[PDB]
């Protein structure tokens, strides 16, 4: 019902406003059943069009959007639909810097425990969000903590004490993105993504170091990726070359039940 609500049901109603409670209940659905956790994602599409058509307000709407984002969102198949809706939400001209900063901090925290495909999706998404809202580059880079060669010795001492007393103020459990204090934090997680094992993912993760010359990144070129694409890409390597071997030698490849390559794995 929710999948087809926005297209095949709502336009045919004489007064579609009566669906607001049903969509609101669908959007607020919280259940222990895992298969029922996707319901708010579907209700969002039907809920969004209603506000657009009649200019309704859902109370603390962006707060619930922040709540819905979770580690499950990146793995569900309907992530593409949600992200397309998110782009419209985060294209608004009245969003506060704290709100967008709260989102970006949470996604970066989520990308930490994510597959490479989701990391490939988020990194351009964060780049677009940071570029859209220029107040948030503090989140990537805080200049007050830079060590400048010209800074006088007293500034060095003040900087040293400032470094010592700093504490990360972002709250993960707070559900109000305007109150998570994410704007005062930093994205160390992306800097950890810089050391991702996959080389291309690292290159996308290195993108935050280099200047933001490019205006925006097409999400359509990064949304559709998965493990199979990476494995399929290597299955077809255009160039073939002699591999580089290990000069080191191991007497035994597994541990017993001299040199063992895999201690803890009996043979």
């Amino acid at each position: 019902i929710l999948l087809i609500l926005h297209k095949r049901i709502i336009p045919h109603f004489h007064t579609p406003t009566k669906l607001m409670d049903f969509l609101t209940d669908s959007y607020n659905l919280q259940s222990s059943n895992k298969n029922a956790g996707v319901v708010p994602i579907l209700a969002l599409n039907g809920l969004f069009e209603l506000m657009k058509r009649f200019n309704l307000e859902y109370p603390n709407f962006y707060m619930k959007l922040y709540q819905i984002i979770n580690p499950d969102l990146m793995h569900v198949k309907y992530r593409a639909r949600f992200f397309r809706l998110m782009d419209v939400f985060l294209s608004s001209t009245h969003l506060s810097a704290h709100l967008v900063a709260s989102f970006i901090k949470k996604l970066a925290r989520l990308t930490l425990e994510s597959p490479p495909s989701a990391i490939v999706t988020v990194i351009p998404f964060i780049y677009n969000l940071i570029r859209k809202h220029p107040n948030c580059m503090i989140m990537l880079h805080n200049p007050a903590f830079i060590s400048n060669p010209f800074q006088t010795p007293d500034q060095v001492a003040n900087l040293k004490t400032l470094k010592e007393n700093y504490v990360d103020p972002f709250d993960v459990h707070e559900s109000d993105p305007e109150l998570t204090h994410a704007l005062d934090s930093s994205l160390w997680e992306l800097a950890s993504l810089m050391e991702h094992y996959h080389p291309n993912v690292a290159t996308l993760a290195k993108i935050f170091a280099q200047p933001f010359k490019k205006l925006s990144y097409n999400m359509e070129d990064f949304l559709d990726w998965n493990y199979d694409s990476l494995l399929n890409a290597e299955s077809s390597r255009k160039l073939k070359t002699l591999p580089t071997l290990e000069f080191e030698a191991f007497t035994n490849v597994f541990d017993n039940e001299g040199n063992v390559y895999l201690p803890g794995v009996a043979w």
């Binding site: 503090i138 007050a144 200047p211």
Partner: protein, 229 residues
Amino acid sequence: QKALPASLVPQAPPVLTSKDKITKRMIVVLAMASLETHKIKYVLLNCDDHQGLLKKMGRDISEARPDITHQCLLTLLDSPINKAGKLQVYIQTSRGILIEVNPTVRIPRTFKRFSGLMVQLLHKLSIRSVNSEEKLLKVIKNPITDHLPTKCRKVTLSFDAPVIRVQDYIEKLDDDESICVFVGAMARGKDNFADEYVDEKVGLSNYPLSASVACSKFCHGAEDAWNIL
């Protein structure tokens, strides 16, 4: 503690020109430059390469060494401040020719092609870029003052003058003004080539200084004073 600006990306600082008089800058003038051309083809007169010809001209060949001008231009141009777009170079040839040196230029480091450039410059009155967009080296009308900034402090390099610290001097000078330095590329002579234009003459070190060494020492202080790095 503070949010970053709208655009942090480093942009090339504006290329200073004689037309702009407002921006603070460090002006250097290599006065009494020994640059002369003569047909043998036209060649820049040199102390060692040509000795008979200058004797026929009747000029003292001791003051016939354009390499001192070459070496200074190399250090002035290669100084970090020039890379920072806070320096323009002026050249008063001993004959009275005043030359504009665009900061963007890249003079050759070999002395022969150095001379080949100036024989072209002296006769053609100007030099055009390889890409043909801007005249790097241009001759300009004397006096120097009209080309200098509206508010500018003028000084010369004088061995006899009191020794000063360049970094302290530039700091105590105002900000809107500019500092203009008159350096003698001459080998030896009286330090009165630019007495008319300057207001006060300063010494940099107690020991005698070569023109390039004095210039390099001066610019480093400006970079230290202005935090050019």
